Amino acid sequence: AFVGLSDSEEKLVRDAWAPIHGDLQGTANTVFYNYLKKYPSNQDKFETLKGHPLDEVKDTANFKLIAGRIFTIFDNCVKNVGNDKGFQKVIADMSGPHVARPITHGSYNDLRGVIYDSMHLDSTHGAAWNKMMDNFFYVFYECLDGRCSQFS
Numbered sequence: 527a528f529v530g531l532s533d534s535e536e537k538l539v540r541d542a543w544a545p546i547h548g549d550l551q552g553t554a555n556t557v558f559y560n561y562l563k564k565y566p567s568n569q570d571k572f573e574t575l576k577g578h579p580l581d582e583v584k585d586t587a588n589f590k591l592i593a594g595r596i597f598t599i600f601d602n603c604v605k606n607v608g609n610d611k612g613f614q615k616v617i618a619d620m621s622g623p624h625v626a627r628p629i630t631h632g633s634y635n636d637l638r639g640v641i642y643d644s645m646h647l648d649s650t651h652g653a654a655w656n657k658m659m660d661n662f663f664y665v666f667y668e669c670l671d672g673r674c675s676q677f678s
């Protein structure tokens with residue numbers, strides 16, 4: 527379910543993300559590369575990347591576009607942590623292209639893990655972050671399941 531965050535937890539999320547917020551594209555490029563490298567089955571889900579070696583595409587405009595657009599969404603979710611309706615709208619709006627693409631929860635969860643691992647959070651910040659990400663995935667999966675109108 528959606529579970530609201532406390533005042534301190536909202537603040538913890540902002541602080542957790544702040545290094546990434548200040549280098550959004552650079553962080554995105556590294557994390558997206560690490561994700562495709564660790565979980566190579568996902569590269570085929572991106573038609574623009576499909577059929578090339580990962581090291582051949584990593585320096586391309588198309589790869590960086592994909593990495594950046596993921597991180598832009600998370601940046602906007604972080605922007606909206608004090609606004610449940612606004613946070614939910616951010617997600618609802620990016621959910622469409624993922625609806626009925628054959629991408630498993632496994633795939634999305636593996637991305638979440640790579641993001642988490644890249645942040646090297648202490649357990650306090652980690653817990654607040656996980657509450658936000660749990661909210662993210664609750665909304666996202668409801669929308670994938672055709673229950674997005676409550677959030678759109």
Ligand code: HEM
Nearest residue numbers: 568571572573595596597599600620623624629633634637
């Ligand atoms: C879970 C975090 C994610 C975020 C924040 C995100 C965000 C986005 C955004 C902003 C779009 C473009 C929406 C539009 O055109 O209006 C998009 C498209 C797309 N996404 Fe994601 N996404 C995520 C996860 C993934 C994963 C894990 C995959 C595959 C494994 C994936 C595959 C795609 C594909 C194939 C497209 C259509 C774009 C294309 O053909 O490249 N996404 N995503």
